[PDB]
mmCIF file of C-alpha atoms (C1' of nucleotides) in Angstrom:
data_model
loop_
_atom_site.group_PDB
_atom_site.id
_atom_site.type_symbol
_atom_site.label_atom_id
_atom_site.label_comp_id
_atom_site.label_asym_id
_atom_site.label_seq_id
_atom_site.Cartn_x
_atom_site.Cartn_y
_atom_site.Cartn_z
ATOM 1 C CA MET A 630 -14.206 -54.169 -22.335
ATOM 2 C CA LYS A 631 -13.265 -51.896 -19.360
ATOM 3 C CA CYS A 632 -10.493 -54.268 -18.281
ATOM 4 C CA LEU A 633 -9.044 -54.836 -21.656
ATOM 5 C CA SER A 634 -9.243 -51.183 -22.318
ATOM 6 C CA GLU A 635 -6.967 -50.839 -19.280
ATOM 7 C CA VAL A 636 -4.938 -53.601 -20.980
ATOM 8 C CA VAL A 637 -4.393 -51.763 -24.187
ATOM 9 C CA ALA A 638 -3.931 -48.442 -22.195
ATOM 10 C CA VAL A 639 -0.873 -50.016 -20.860
ATOM 11 C CA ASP A 640 0.335 -51.559 -24.104
ATOM 12 C CA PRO A 641 -1.013 -49.337 -27.113
ATOM 13 C CA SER A 642 1.145 -51.550 -29.565
ATOM 14 C CA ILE A 643 -1.509 -54.312 -29.877
ATOM 15 C CA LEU A 644 -4.300 -52.449 -31.470
ATOM 16 C CA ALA A 645 -3.779 -54.031 -34.914
ATOM 17 C CA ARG A 646 -5.213 -57.592 -34.542
ATOM 18 C CA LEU A 647 -8.225 -57.767 -36.742
ATOM 19 C CA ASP A 648 -10.646 -59.765 -34.600
ATOM 20 C CA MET A 649 -10.352 -57.445 -31.627
ATOM 21 C CA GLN A 650 -10.773 -54.642 -34.096
ATOM 22 C CA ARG A 651 -14.075 -56.156 -35.121
ATOM 23 C CA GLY A 652 -15.029 -56.546 -31.636
ATOM 24 C CA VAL A 653 -14.472 -53.017 -30.575
ATOM 25 C CA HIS A 654 -16.316 -51.706 -33.717
ATOM 26 C CA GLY A 655 -19.204 -53.881 -32.862
ATOM 27 C CA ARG A 656 -19.289 -52.616 -29.408
ATOM 28 C CA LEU A 657 -19.191 -49.051 -30.765
ATOM 29 C CA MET A 658 -22.372 -49.953 -32.625
ATOM 30 C CA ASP A 659 -23.733 -52.299 -29.869
ATOM 31 C CA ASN A 660 -27.267 -51.689 -28.753
ATOM 32 C CA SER A 661 -26.335 -50.563 -25.242
ATOM 33 C CA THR A 662 -24.963 -47.583 -23.606
ATOM 34 C CA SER A 663 -22.282 -49.131 -21.262
ATOM 35 C CA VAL A 664 -20.421 -50.995 -23.835
ATOM 36 C CA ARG A 665 -20.383 -47.774 -26.033
ATOM 37 C CA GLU A 666 -18.702 -45.744 -23.205
ATOM 38 C CA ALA A 667 -16.201 -48.520 -22.557
ATOM 39 C CA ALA A 668 -15.236 -48.711 -26.170
ATOM 40 C CA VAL A 669 -15.063 -44.864 -26.670
ATOM 41 C CA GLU A 670 -12.982 -44.788 -23.384
ATOM 42 C CA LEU A 671 -10.647 -47.353 -25.061
ATOM 43 C CA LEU A 672 -10.309 -45.214 -28.087
ATOM 44 C CA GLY A 673 -9.826 -42.134 -26.156
ATOM 45 C CA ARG A 674 -7.065 -43.577 -24.173
ATOM 46 C CA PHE A 675 -5.463 -44.780 -27.229
ATOM 47 C CA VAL A 676 -5.751 -41.198 -28.670
ATOM 48 C CA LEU A 677 -4.205 -39.571 -25.542
ATOM 49 C CA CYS A 678 -1.362 -42.091 -25.287
ATOM 50 C CA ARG A 679 -0.798 -42.104 -29.194
ATOM 51 C CA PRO A 680 -1.804 -38.781 -30.754
ATOM 52 C CA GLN A 681 -0.658 -39.983 -34.121
ATOM 53 C CA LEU A 682 -2.263 -42.842 -36.200
ATOM 54 C CA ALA A 683 -5.741 -42.383 -34.459
ATOM 55 C CA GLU A 684 -6.768 -39.438 -36.736
ATOM 56 C CA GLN A 685 -7.836 -42.270 -39.278
ATOM 57 C CA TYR A 686 -10.370 -43.325 -36.588
ATOM 58 C CA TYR A 687 -11.138 -39.649 -35.687
ATOM 59 C CA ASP A 688 -14.314 -39.738 -37.803
ATOM 60 C CA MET A 689 -15.889 -42.626 -35.890
ATOM 61 C CA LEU A 690 -14.740 -40.848 -32.440
ATOM 62 C CA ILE A 691 -16.439 -37.572 -33.589
ATOM 63 C CA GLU A 692 -19.639 -39.495 -34.728
ATOM 64 C CA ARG A 693 -19.816 -41.014 -31.264
ATOM 65 C CA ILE A 694 -20.517 -37.670 -29.637
ATOM 66 C CA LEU A 695 -24.314 -38.021 -30.258
ATOM 67 C CA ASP A 696 -25.304 -41.298 -28.581
ATOM 68 C CA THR A 697 -28.621 -40.687 -26.685
ATOM 69 C CA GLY A 698 -26.943 -41.826 -23.600
ATOM 70 C CA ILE A 699 -26.031 -39.955 -20.400
ATOM 71 C CA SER A 700 -22.370 -40.784 -19.431
ATOM 72 C CA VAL A 701 -21.290 -41.679 -22.947
ATOM 73 C CA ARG A 702 -21.574 -37.987 -24.073
ATOM 74 C CA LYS A 703 -19.650 -36.982 -21.012
ATOM 75 C CA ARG A 704 -16.960 -39.379 -21.553
ATOM 76 C CA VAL A 705 -16.540 -38.361 -25.277
ATOM 77 C CA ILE A 706 -16.609 -34.640 -24.124
ATOM 78 C CA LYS A 707 -13.650 -35.464 -21.761
ATOM 79 C CA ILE A 708 -11.814 -37.275 -24.553
ATOM 80 C CA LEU A 709 -12.136 -34.397 -27.028
ATOM 81 C CA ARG A 710 -11.592 -31.883 -24.501
ATOM 82 C CA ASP A 711 -8.188 -33.499 -23.648
ATOM 83 C CA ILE A 712 -7.403 -33.753 -27.326
ATOM 84 C CA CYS A 713 -7.973 -30.071 -27.679
ATOM 85 C CA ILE A 714 -5.933 -29.292 -24.603
ATOM 86 C CA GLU A 715 -2.977 -31.465 -25.282
ATOM 87 C CA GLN A 716 -2.281 -31.086 -29.046
ATOM 88 C CA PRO A 717 -2.860 -27.712 -30.873
ATOM 89 C CA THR A 718 -2.469 -27.389 -34.732
ATOM 90 C CA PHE A 719 -4.321 -30.581 -35.343
ATOM 91 C CA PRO A 720 -5.939 -30.042 -38.809
ATOM 92 C CA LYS A 721 -9.638 -30.803 -37.809
ATOM 93 C CA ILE A 722 -9.839 -28.991 -34.485
ATOM 94 C CA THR A 723 -12.068 -26.117 -35.203
ATOM 95 C CA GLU A 724 -14.731 -28.245 -37.178
ATOM 96 C CA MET A 725 -14.601 -30.563 -34.132
ATOM 97 C CA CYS A 726 -15.053 -27.514 -31.849
ATOM 98 C CA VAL A 727 -18.337 -26.697 -33.750
ATOM 99 C CA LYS A 728 -20.026 -29.919 -32.887
ATOM 100 C CA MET A 729 -20.341 -29.982 -29.046
ATOM 101 C CA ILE A 730 -21.485 -26.411 -28.729
ATOM 102 C CA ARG A 731 -24.429 -27.808 -30.804
ATOM 103 C CA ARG A 732 -25.053 -30.015 -27.806
ATOM 104 C CA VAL A 733 -24.872 -27.396 -25.058
ATOM 105 C CA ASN A 734 -28.570 -27.104 -24.733
ATOM 106 C CA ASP A 735 -29.344 -30.790 -24.709
ATOM 107 C CA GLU A 736 -29.147 -31.675 -20.889
ATOM 108 C CA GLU A 737 -28.521 -29.502 -17.710
ATOM 109 C CA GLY A 738 -25.255 -31.507 -16.907
ATOM 110 C CA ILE A 739 -23.768 -31.310 -20.374
ATOM 111 C CA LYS A 740 -24.541 -27.567 -20.281
ATOM 112 C CA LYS A 741 -22.503 -27.213 -17.074
ATOM 113 C CA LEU A 742 -19.559 -29.450 -17.786
ATOM 114 C CA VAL A 743 -19.081 -27.967 -21.422
ATOM 115 C CA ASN A 744 -19.326 -24.433 -19.854
ATOM 116 C CA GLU A 745 -16.557 -24.642 -17.388
ATOM 117 C CA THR A 746 -14.589 -26.819 -20.069
ATOM 118 C CA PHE A 747 -14.646 -23.909 -22.528
ATOM 119 C CA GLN A 748 -14.217 -21.316 -19.853
ATOM 120 C CA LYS A 749 -11.008 -22.917 -18.758
ATOM 121 C CA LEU A 750 -10.165 -23.633 -22.443
ATOM 122 C CA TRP A 751 -10.924 -20.162 -23.759
ATOM 123 C CA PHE A 752 -12.385 -17.505 -21.222
ATOM 124 C CA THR A 753 -9.655 -17.020 -18.579
ATOM 125 C CA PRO A 754 -8.456 -13.742 -17.330
ATOM 126 C CA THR A 755 -5.029 -13.848 -19.288
ATOM 127 C CA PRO A 756 -2.887 -11.024 -17.629
ATOM 128 C CA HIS A 757 -0.832 -8.622 -19.631
ATOM 129 C CA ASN A 758 1.633 -11.050 -21.046
ATOM 130 C CA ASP A 759 2.024 -13.801 -23.756
ATOM 131 C CA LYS A 760 0.575 -11.962 -26.694
ATOM 132 C CA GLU A 761 0.877 -14.858 -29.159
ATOM 133 C CA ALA A 762 -1.398 -17.201 -26.924
ATOM 134 C CA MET A 763 -4.005 -14.652 -27.010
ATOM 135 C CA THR A 764 -3.423 -14.233 -30.724
ATOM 136 C CA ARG A 765 -3.975 -17.858 -31.855
ATOM 137 C CA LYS A 766 -6.905 -17.950 -29.240
ATOM 138 C CA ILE A 767 -8.354 -15.150 -31.225
ATOM 139 C CA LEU A 768 -7.605 -16.968 -34.429
ATOM 140 C CA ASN A 769 -9.346 -20.244 -33.320
ATOM 141 C CA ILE A 770 -12.423 -18.270 -32.168
ATOM 142 C CA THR A 771 -12.572 -16.535 -35.615
ATOM 143 C CA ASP A 772 -12.287 -20.005 -37.358
ATOM 144 C CA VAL A 773 -15.112 -21.334 -35.096
ATOM 145 C CA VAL A 774 -17.370 -18.475 -35.837
ATOM 146 C CA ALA A 775 -16.492 -18.804 -39.565
ATOM 147 C CA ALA A 776 -17.281 -22.370 -39.799
ATOM 148 C CA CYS A 777 -20.654 -21.495 -37.680
ATOM 149 C CA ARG A 778 -22.157 -19.517 -40.518
ATOM 150 C CA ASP A 779 -23.537 -22.396 -42.601
ATOM 151 C CA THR A 780 -25.635 -24.130 -39.856
ATOM 152 C CA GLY A 781 -26.562 -21.439 -37.392
ATOM 153 C CA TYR A 782 -25.370 -18.905 -34.787
ATOM 154 C CA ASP A 783 -27.909 -19.342 -32.018
ATOM 155 C CA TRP A 784 -26.095 -22.034 -30.245
ATOM 156 C CA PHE A 785 -22.972 -20.102 -29.503
ATOM 157 C CA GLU A 786 -24.824 -16.919 -28.298
ATOM 158 C CA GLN A 787 -26.929 -19.190 -26.153
ATOM 159 C CA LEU A 788 -23.470 -20.465 -24.626
ATOM 160 C CA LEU A 789 -22.538 -16.828 -24.232
ATOM 161 C CA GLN A 790 -25.821 -16.280 -22.181
ATOM 162 C CA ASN A 791 -25.115 -19.515 -20.275
ATOM 163 C CA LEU A 792 -21.766 -17.962 -19.162
ATOM 164 C CA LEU A 793 -23.508 -14.559 -18.403
ATOM 165 C CA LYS A 794 -26.118 -15.933 -16.184
ATOM 166 C CA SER A 795 -23.723 -18.350 -14.477
ATOM 167 C CA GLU A 796 -22.091 -15.384 -12.607
ATOM 168 C CA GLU A 797 -25.051 -13.526 -11.106
ATOM 169 C CA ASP A 798 -22.868 -11.736 -8.274
ATOM 170 C CA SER A 799 -19.456 -10.079 -8.679
ATOM 171 C CA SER A 800 -17.300 -13.248 -8.407
ATOM 172 C CA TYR A 801 -14.463 -11.005 -9.488
ATOM 173 C CA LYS A 802 -16.219 -11.071 -12.985
ATOM 174 C CA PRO A 803 -13.481 -13.362 -14.333
ATOM 175 C CA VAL A 804 -15.001 -13.925 -17.937
ATOM 176 C CA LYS A 805 -16.491 -10.229 -18.160
ATOM 177 C CA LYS A 806 -12.959 -8.575 -17.829
ATOM 178 C CA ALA A 807 -11.554 -11.182 -20.188
ATOM 179 C CA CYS A 808 -14.633 -10.412 -22.402
ATOM 180 C CA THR A 809 -13.676 -6.771 -22.882
ATOM 181 C CA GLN A 810 -9.993 -8.049 -22.893
ATOM 182 C CA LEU A 811 -11.020 -9.978 -26.025
ATOM 183 C CA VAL A 812 -13.248 -7.428 -27.941
ATOM 184 C CA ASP A 813 -10.678 -4.519 -28.119
ATOM 185 C CA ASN A 814 -8.036 -6.995 -29.069
ATOM 186 C CA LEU A 815 -10.320 -8.039 -31.961
ATOM 187 C CA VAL A 816 -10.637 -4.283 -32.637
ATOM 188 C CA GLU A 817 -6.889 -4.247 -32.263
ATOM 189 C CA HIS A 818 -6.834 -7.216 -34.758
ATOM 190 C CA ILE A 819 -8.926 -4.943 -37.112
ATOM 191 C CA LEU A 820 -6.466 -2.077 -36.275
ATOM 192 C CA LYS A 821 -3.811 -4.259 -37.560
ATOM 193 C CA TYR A 822 -5.920 -5.959 -40.343
ATOM 194 C CA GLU A 823 -5.851 -2.928 -42.568
ATOM 195 C CA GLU A 824 -5.836 -5.027 -45.828
ATOM 196 C CA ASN A 835 -8.144 -12.012 -46.649
ATOM 197 C CA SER A 836 -11.660 -10.588 -46.494
ATOM 198 C CA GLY A 837 -12.953 -13.849 -45.132
ATOM 199 C CA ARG A 838 -11.000 -13.236 -42.062
ATOM 200 C CA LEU A 839 -12.377 -9.722 -41.815
ATOM 201 C "C1'" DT B 1 96.934 161.100 45.472
ATOM 202 C "C1'" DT B 2 92.106 159.528 42.798
ATOM 203 C "C1'" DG B 3 88.836 157.777 39.051
ATOM 204 C "C1'" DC B 4 88.435 154.296 36.008
ATOM 205 C "C1'" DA B 5 89.272 149.512 33.844
ATOM 206 C "C1'" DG B 6 90.417 145.406 34.681
ATOM 207 C "C1'" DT B 7 91.963 141.241 38.043
ATOM 208 C "C1'" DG B 8 91.957 137.820 42.219
ATOM 209 C "C1'" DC B 9 89.948 135.475 45.767
ATOM 210 C "C1'" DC B 10 86.669 133.597 48.924
ATOM 211 C "C1'" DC B 11 82.228 131.892 49.355
ATOM 212 C "C1'" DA B 12 78.297 129.354 48.393
ATOM 213 C "C1'" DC B 13 74.213 127.344 46.455
ATOM 214 C "C1'" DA B 14 73.449 124.852 42.524
ATOM 215 C "C1'" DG B 15 74.402 121.243 39.636
ATOM 216 C "C1'" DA B 16 75.653 116.961 38.954
ATOM 217 C "C1'" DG B 17 76.706 112.071 39.262
ATOM 218 C "C1'" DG B 18 78.291 108.160 41.918
ATOM 219 C "C1'" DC B 19 76.416 105.692 46.194
ATOM 220 C "C1'" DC B 20 72.802 103.133 48.178
ATOM 221 C "C1'" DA B 21 68.420 100.560 49.747
ATOM 222 C "C1'" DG B 22 64.172 99.425 48.029
ATOM 223 C "C1'" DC B 23 61.725 96.752 44.851
ATOM 224 C "C1'" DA B 24 59.782 94.314 40.816
ATOM 225 C "C1'" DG B 25 60.877 91.451 36.578
ATOM 226 C "C1'" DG B 26 61.781 86.342 34.590
ATOM 227 C "C1'" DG B 27 63.321 81.957 35.747
ATOM 228 C "C1'" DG B 28 65.414 77.409 38.311
ATOM 229 C "C1'" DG B 29 64.745 73.962 41.803
ATOM 230 C "C1'" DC B 30 62.274 71.696 45.872
ATOM 231 C "C1'" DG B 31 58.166 70.003 49.876
ATOM 232 C "C1'" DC B 32 54.008 67.947 49.737
ATOM 233 C "C1'" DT B 33 49.600 66.136 48.096
ATOM 234 C "C1'" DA B 34 44.655 64.649 45.775
ATOM 235 C "C1'" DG B 35 43.106 62.073 42.415
ATOM 236 C "C1'" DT B 36 43.056 58.981 39.016
ATOM 237 C "C1'" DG B 37 44.866 55.166 35.989
ATOM 238 C "C1'" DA B 38 46.325 50.787 35.285
ATOM 239 C "C1'" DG B 39 48.070 46.304 36.646
ATOM 240 C "C1'" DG B 40 48.138 42.225 39.329
ATOM 241 C "C1'" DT B 41 46.212 38.941 42.574
ATOM 242 C "C1'" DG B 42 42.590 36.310 44.697
ATOM 243 C "C1'" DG B 43 37.809 34.681 44.942
ATOM 244 C "C1'" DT B 44 34.018 33.103 43.026
ATOM 245 C "C1'" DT B 45 31.188 30.875 40.173
ATOM 246 C "C1'" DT B 46 30.534 28.892 36.285
ATOM 247 C "C1'" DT B 47 30.830 26.497 32.628
ATOM 248 C "C1'" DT B 48 32.465 23.097 30.142
ATOM 249 C "C1'" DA B 49 33.385 18.605 30.549
ATOM 250 C "C1'" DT B 50 33.579 13.906 32.324
ATOM 251 C "C1'" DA B 51 31.675 9.578 34.271
ATOM 252 C "C1'" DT B 52 28.059 6.751 36.522
ATOM 253 C "C1'" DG B 53 23.458 4.884 36.823
ATOM 254 C "C1'" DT B 54 19.039 4.161 34.811
ATOM 255 C "C1'" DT B 55 16.191 3.401 31.217
ATOM 256 C "C1'" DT B 56 15.145 2.899 26.424
ATOM 257 C "C1'" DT B 57 15.951 0.608 22.268
ATOM 258 C "C1'" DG B 58 17.171 -3.159 19.401
ATOM 259 C "C1'" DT B 59 17.753 -7.937 18.566
ATOM 260 C "C1'" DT B 60 16.620 -12.908 19.346
ATOM 261 C "C1'" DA B 61 13.878 -17.036 20.282
ATOM 262 C "C1'" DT B 62 9.548 -19.465 21.107
ATOM 263 C "C1'" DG B 63 4.584 -20.412 20.531
ATOM 264 C "C1'" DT B 64 0.451 -19.811 18.093
ATOM 265 C "C1'" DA B 65 -2.005 -19.246 14.155
ATOM 266 C "C1'" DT B 66 -2.823 -19.480 9.122
ATOM 267 C "C1'" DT B 67 -2.396 -21.617 4.686
ATOM 268 C "C1'" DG B 68 -1.645 -25.394 2.076
ATOM 269 C "C1'" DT B 69 -1.582 -31.106 0.696
ATOM 270 C "C1'" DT B 70 -2.492 -35.375 0.034
ATOM 271 C "C1'" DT B 71 -5.603 -38.454 1.596
ATOM 272 C "C1'" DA B 72 -10.494 -39.814 2.691
ATOM 273 C "C1'" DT B 73 -14.833 -40.560 3.866
ATOM 274 C "C1'" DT B 74 -19.010 -38.407 1.751
ATOM 275 C "C1'" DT B 75 -21.806 -37.519 -1.883
ATOM 276 C "C1'" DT B 76 -23.839 -37.473 -5.745
ATOM 277 C "C1'" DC B 77 -24.337 -38.422 -10.534
ATOM 278 C "C1'" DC B 78 -25.254 -42.214 -13.492
ATOM 279 C "C1'" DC B 79 -26.554 -47.026 -14.853
ATOM 280 C "C1'" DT B 80 -29.358 -52.032 -14.990
ATOM 281 C "C1'" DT B 81 -32.709 -54.634 -11.789
ATOM 282 C "C1'" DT B 82 -36.407 -55.485 -9.037
ATOM 283 C "C1'" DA B 83 -41.030 -54.208 -5.642
ATOM 284 C "C1'" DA B 84 -44.643 -51.927 -5.049
ATOM 285 C "C1'" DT B 85 -48.112 -49.648 -7.548
ATOM 286 C "C1'" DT B 86 -51.075 -48.229 -10.797
ATOM 287 C "C1'" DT B 87 -54.488 -48.943 -14.896
ATOM 288 C "C1'" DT B 88 -57.596 -51.692 -17.746
ATOM 289 C "C1'" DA B 89 -60.903 -54.920 -18.693
ATOM 290 C "C1'" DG B 90 -64.291 -59.013 -16.917
ATOM 291 C "C1'" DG B 91 -67.162 -61.258 -13.673
ATOM 292 C "C1'" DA B 92 -70.138 -60.947 -10.023
ATOM 293 C "C1'" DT B 93 -73.055 -58.218 -6.649
ATOM 294 C "C1'" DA B 94 -76.790 -55.371 -5.035
ATOM 295 C "C1'" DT B 95 -80.353 -52.420 -4.396
ATOM 296 C "C1'" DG B 96 -83.909 -50.308 -7.060
ATOM 297 C "C1'" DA B 97 -87.691 -50.168 -9.556
ATOM 298 C "C1'" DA B 98 -91.034 -51.515 -12.522
ATOM 299 C "C1'" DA B 99 -94.217 -55.275 -13.080
ATOM 300 C "C1'" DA B 100 -97.150 -58.594 -11.982
ATOM 301 C "C1'" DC B 101 -100.112 -60.639 -8.483
ATOM 302 C "C1'" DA B 102 -103.127 -60.508 -4.698
ATOM 303 C "C1'" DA B 103 -106.096 -57.744 -1.425
ATOM 304 C "C1'" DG B 104 -109.785 -53.948 0.009
ATOM 305 C "C1'" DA B 105 -112.969 -51.077 -1.679
ATOM 306 C "C1'" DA B 106 -116.564 -49.144 -4.473
ATOM 307 C "C1'" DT B 107 -120.207 -49.293 -8.154
#
DNA sequence: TTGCAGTGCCCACAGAGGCCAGCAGGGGGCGCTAGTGAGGTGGTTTTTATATGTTTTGTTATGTATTGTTTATTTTCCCTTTAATTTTAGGATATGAAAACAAGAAT
């Protein structure tokens, strides 16, 4: 599977033949970890090389996040982090962005890699320029916390405490400054909201 | 001839005015000199100015140290597979302790 995953990574225009489709699906639901990470790595390489036409299989991809393994979840986090970082405006990002913070407390290693993943993804210093990037960053955060209400809020604040404890010394306080750089901007958003109540 | 009334003449002493030396008035022209005043020349220094030597400043080139870069050998996190290692009966041992027997002792 790993080798033929490299093969289809070279040539994405083969992932239509039905018997290999049955085989890769069976290895997704095979009773072993290593085949599962090989198959999800195949699908993730297909997704990164071909952003389109894989969203029909995105439901299987997003249900492979929870696999009771160790490296399978690291691999699927890498896949979804690269999906998030390379194509914005995908219609099911924020719902996606919910599910892995639900797994931040699961293991110590996942806790780490997710923490710096989102810290590079969201909580960067962002100097005084490029207002629109900060703007739809704020928009994405609001969509995440809005989709957060049905299940529960404790996971994301636990993530916040994970970032808080991670910098026990000064270390320039990179998120911390950015933290206040967020909140007044949200106040600024409120300052420009002025009138839609779901976003409020 | 005389007395009286009136005239002539001579002198003389002031009386008068020209003559004269003496003397004082105003201004003309020269003999000579003390004392500045100014102008010109020479000396001195001095002051500006000019040129030379030394040093200071500015520019250039080389070497060392610092930061960055793709390797590159750790290294370390994560699998599937054994190699001790542990736990649970199951049988056998042992060492004890009553139990029975045999041996003094008494009645």
